[PDB]
Amino acid sequence: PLKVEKFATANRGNGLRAVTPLRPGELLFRSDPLAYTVCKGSRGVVCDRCLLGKEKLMRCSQCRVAKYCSAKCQKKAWPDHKRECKCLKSCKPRYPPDSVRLLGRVVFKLMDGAPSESEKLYSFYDLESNINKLTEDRKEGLRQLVMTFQHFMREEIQDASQLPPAFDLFEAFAKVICNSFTICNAEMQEVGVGLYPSISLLNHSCDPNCSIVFNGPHLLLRAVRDIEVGEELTICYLDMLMTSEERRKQLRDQYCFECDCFRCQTQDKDADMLTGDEQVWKEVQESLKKIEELKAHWKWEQVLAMCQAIISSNSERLPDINIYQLKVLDCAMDACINLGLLEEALFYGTRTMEPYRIFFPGSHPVRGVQVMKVGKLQLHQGMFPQAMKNLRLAFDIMRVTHGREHSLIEDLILLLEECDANI
Ligand SMILES: CCCOC(=O)N1CCN(C(=O)c2ccc3cc4c(nc3c2)C[C@H](CN)CC4)[C@@H](C)C1
Ligand SMILES: C[S@@+](CC[C@H](N)C(=O)[O-])C[C@H]1O[C@@H](n2cnc3c(N)ncnc32)[C@H](O)[C@@H]1O
Ligand SMILES: [Zn+2]
Ligand SMILES: [Zn+2]
Ligand SMILES: [Zn+2]
């Protein structure tokens, strides 16, 4: 029996609402993707199927584009890769945009696969497209995506007979724009993109009552506040380290709606997020585009070099509560962790702790993972009482946001017992 249900909202299209009272941490829905693929920066870095990292990946011999962590992953992924393999091969060395490879797997899954469990509450055909709200510039971009799809898929799709009935590629890409799920690994690094049509019923809130976490390509939807019967379920579509101005632009450009919530009306936390000299965090925000680009490609040495030039600059510096300064600290922490610079990683990580408590209120999986990384670093140093405090705080958050069904919770339990035995 489902604890959620689809309903027609008053002004947000369709949505999800509770059929029973919900408590923080309660599992509401589980879903594998209808279709998913590794994102551009993690291609060749994580396994195409399980989205886990590895030093040595084996490649598909036919296309040499798909890469896997094991023979089990390569063989199990063959049915959903067989038809895209001929297309990736014949289009070498041109790799398509992530959304184009995603839509190709949607078509193959819809044409050759049994009805997907991911479409139980809501199908790909049901997905919102926002067609009558798209700007002319957006339409032109979609038309280029359509022609990109036709060029990349010509080996396997020649006409509409190879597409599902009444399938419009323009409308399909419009659905992808506002229904794609960025997939992050356990360490909160973006590794993939997928479509989860039942989950696509969740509308947005800048202060939501639900939250999702990814365990590989598997999606877990949990409540993070108390929810009563009939109350709409909401998740936050956006990164928490954004101003209401930045939220307005992305919700307009990507999702075609204006947010009326209390946070956007009052510019909640905007002033604290932009403390420090404006000229400085304008330049830091500029450098962040290259920093986050390099991190998306796992170039940790180059990330750390750019972050140190900001964190330990000779010129004017920013408070750690400034979001762009905070983002540089987070990038520098993750770089040092992957480079084995654990003392320097703890220094940056501990500095993010108080701003993260402010900007990730309640139970948020991003803060839970961040607190776990800091506690794990402190445990390796021998700072046992400080490590336990954070590891228990991480568990307080992640028992709500991740739950028993997420494997990272098992990793945290092992850290908790090892450091508890230490104390
Ligand atoms: C139909 C679209 C649904 O709405 C959305 O786009 N969401 C709602 C649900 N979600 C997540 O929980 C979600 C999934 C992966 C994430 C990976 C990272 C971060 N945060 C994430 C949030 C923040 C980190 C900050 N360094 C970077 C890594 C995303 C897919 C966005
Ligand atoms: C992932 S879908 C959510 C479900 C959608 N309402 C539907 O009927 O399929 C995202 C779309 O829902 C609408 N939406 C989401 N959150 C909203 C909100 N807070 N206010 C108004 N519309 C919203 C926007 O049109 C957005 O493009
Ligand atoms: Zn794998
Ligand atoms: Zn292949
Ligand atoms: Zn809002």
- Distance of alpha carbon 95 from alpha carbon 97, whole angstroms: 7
Is 204 annotated as contributing to ligand binding? Answer: yes
Instruction: Give CA separation, 112 vs 80, 81, 102, 115, 164, in Å.
Output: 9, 12, 15, 9, 10
Whole-number Å distance between alpha carbons of 191 and 196: 16
CB of 179 closer than 6 A to ligand 2? yes
Q: Tell me the one-letter amino acid at 172.
A: A
Asked whether the bond before 208 is cis by omega within 30 degrees of 0, the reply is no
Contact of 107 with 160, CB cutoff 8 Å: no
Question: How many C-alpha atoms does 277 have within 13 Å on its Cβ side?
Answer: 8
Q: Give the number of C-alpha atoms closer than 13 A to the C-alpha of residue 414, restricted to the C-beta side.
A: 5
Q: What is the C-alpha to C-alpha distance for residues 394 and 23, in angstroms, rounded to an integer?
A: 19
Q: Which residues of 97-118 are buried (b: 16+ CB within 10 A; e: fewer)?
A: ebbbbbbbbbbbbbeeeeebeb
User: Tokens at residue 378, please?
Assistant: 């402190």
Centre of ligand 1 from the C-alpha of residue 247, in Å: 14
For residues 386 and 194, what is the distance between their CA atoms, to the nearest angstrom?
38
Distances (CA, A) of 291 to 285, 353, 402: 10, 21, 28
Say how many Å lie between the CA of residue 34 and the centre of ligand 3. Answer: 18
Instruction: Please give the domain boundaries of the chain with CATH numbers for all domains.
Output: 1-45+181-271 (2.170.270.10), 46-94 (6.10.140.2220), 95-180 (1.10.220.160), 272-351 (1.25.40.970), 352-423 (1.25.40.10)
Determine whether the annotation assigns residue 203 to a binding site. yes
The closest ligand to the CA of 180 turns out to be 1
Please calculate the CA angle 29-34-36 and round it to the nearest 5 degrees: 110
* 263 Cα–ligand 5 center, Å: 5
Report whether 315 contacts 327 (CB < 8 A): no
Residue nearest to atom 6 of ligand 1 (CA): 237
Surface-to-core class of residue 53, CB atoms within 10 Å of its CB (0-12 exposed, 13-18 middle, 19+ buried): middle
Q: Which of 63, 68, 111, 112 is nearest to 88 (CA)?
A: 63
Tell me the backbone φ, ψ of residue 331, rounded to 5 degrees.
-65, -40
The ligand minimizing its distance to the Cα of 194 is 1
Answer yes or no: is 87 a known binding residue.
no
Quote the CA–CA distance of 51 and 181 in Å, as a whole number. Answer: 14
- Name the residue with the closest Cα to ligand 1, atom 8: 237
Nearest residue by C-alpha to atom 20 in ligand 1? 239
Give the nearest ligand 1 atom to 327 CA.
26
Q: How many CA atoms lie within 13 A of 135 on its CB side?
A: 9
Contact 140, 189 (CB under 8 A): no
What tokens appear for 321 in the block? Answer: 């509560």
Q: How far apart are the first and last CA of the chain?
A: 44
Measure the CA–CA gap between 341 and 72, rounded to whole angstroms: 34
**Is 204 close to ligand 2, i.e. is its CB under 6 Å away?**
yes
Structure tokens, 217: 């390509």
- Asked if residue 93 has a cis previous peptide bond (ω within 30° of 0), the answer is yes
Beta bridge partners of 14: 8
Which two tokens mark 17?
Answer: 């609402």
Contact 101, 80 (CB under 8 A): no
- CA of 261 relative to ligand 5 center, distance in Å: 4
Q: Is 175 left (phi over 0), alpha (psi -120 to 50) or beta?
A: alpha
Tracing tokens 């330990």 back to the chain, one arrives at 312
Pairing of strands 27-31, 218-223: antiparallel
Resolution at which this structure was determined, Å: 2.1
Beta bridge partners of 213: 220
Residue 179 · residue 128 · CB < 8 Å: yes
**CA dist list (Å): 210 to 17, 223, 244, 357, 365:** 11, 4, 20, 18, 11
Angle formed by the axes of helices 98-112 and 78-90, nearest 10°: 130
Tokens read off for 127: 């997905």
Which atom of ligand 1 is closest in space to residue 331's alpha carbon? 26
Contact call for residues 219 and 143 (beta carbons, < 8 A): no
Q: Is residue 200 in contact with ligand 2, taking CB distance under 6 Å?
A: yes
Inter-CA distances, 260 with 2, 14, 257, Å: 29, 17, 9
d(CA 116, CA 110): 8
184 is in an annotated binding site: no
Ligand 2, atom 2, lies closest to the CA of: 200
Which atom of ligand 1 has the smallest separation from the CA of 178? Answer: 1
* Closest residue to atom 23 of ligand 1, CA basis: 239
By the 8 A CB rule, do 183 and 51 touch? yes
130 in a labelled binding site: yes
13 lines ligand 2 (CB under 6 A): yes
β-bridge pairing 203-204 and 232-235: parallel
Q: Which residues line ligand 1 (CB under 6 A)?
A: 179, 181-182, 184, 188, 190, 200, 212, 214, 235, 237, 239, 330, 366
- Tell me, in angstroms, the distance from the centre of ligand 4 to residue 104's CA: 14
Closest CA to 192 of 71, 302, 65, 33: 33
User: How far is the C-alpha of 62 from the C-alpha of 189, rounded, in Å?
Assistant: 29
Integer CA distances (angstroms), 361 to 168, 225, 357, 392, in order: 41, 11, 6, 17
HEC string of the chain?
CCCEEEEECCCCCEEEEECCCECCCCEEEEECCCEEEECHHHCCCECCCCCCECCCCEECCCCCCCEECCHHHHHHCHHHHHHHHHHHHHCCCCCCCHHHHHHHHHHHHHHHCCCCHHHCCCCCCCCCCCHHHCCHHHHHHHHHHHHHHHHHCCCCCCCHHHCCCCCCHHHHHHHHHCCEEEEECCCCCEEEEEECCCHHHCEECCCCCEEEEEECCEEEEEECCCECCCCEEEECCCCCCCCHHHHHHHHHHCCCCCCCCHHHHHCCCHHHHCCCCHHHHHHHHHHHHHHHHHHHCCCHHHHHHHHHHHHCCCCCCCCCCCHHHHHHHHHHHHHHHHCCCHHHHHHHHHHCHHHHHHHCCCCCHHHHHHHHHHHHHHHHHCCHHHHHHHHHHHHHHHHHHCCCCCHHHHHHHHHHHHHHHHC
Residue 28 main-chain phi, psi, to 5 deg:
-100, -35
Greatest C-alpha distance within the chain: 67
Residues in the chain: 423
Q: How far is CA 166 from CA 140, 171, 172, 230, 256, in A?
A: 22, 11, 11, 34, 24
How far apart are the C-alpha atoms of 115 and 407, rounded to whole Å?
28
Taken in order 56, 67, 331, 359, the sign of the CA dihedral is: negative
Say which residues have a Cβ less than 8 Å from residue 328's Cβ, sequence separation at least 6.
284, 287, 288, 291, 307, 310, 311
Q: Which residue, among 20, 1, 69, has the nearest Cα to 231 in the 3D structure? A: 20
CA distance 389 to 395: 10
